[PDB]
Amino acid sequence: GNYNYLYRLFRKSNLKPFERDISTEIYQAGSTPCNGVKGFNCYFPLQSYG
Amino acid sequence: ASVYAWNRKRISNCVADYSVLYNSASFSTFKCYGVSPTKLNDLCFTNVYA
Numbered sequence A: 001g002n003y004n005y006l007y008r009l010f011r012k013s014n015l016k017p018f019e020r021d022i023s024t025e026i027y028q029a030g031s032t033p034c035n036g037v038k039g040f041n042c043y044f045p046l047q048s049y050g
Numbered sequence B: 001a002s003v004y005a006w007n008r009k010r011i012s013n014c015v016a017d018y019s020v021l022y023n024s025a026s027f028s029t030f031k032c033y034g035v036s037p038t039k040l041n042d043l044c045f046t047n048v049y050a
Helices: B018-022 B037-041
Strands: A006-008 A046-048
Antiparallel strands (some): A006 A046
C-alpha cells in the first residue's frame, strides 16, 4: 500500500470555495479538550488511502 | 453470549441517546460505519439490533 496519499477526515468547520488548510492539529470530537495529543474522542485529522 | 450463538434484541419505538454510549471512555473500540458517532443523535432508523 502507498500510504503517502492522505485526506483530512476531520475539521472544526467545512471549507469555503478554494479554501486550503495544511494544519495537522488534533480534532476534539469529545466533551473535554485534547491537550494537543491523541486520545478518546481526540483524533489526528489526516487519514490514508494506502 | 457465546459468539457462535450471539444475543439480539429488537430496539424500536424509542429515542436512541447514542451520546450515552460514545461520551463514555469505557469502550476499547467504538467504530461507526457510514456515519460519524456524533451525527447519530440527529438520525433515525426503523429498528436497531444489539
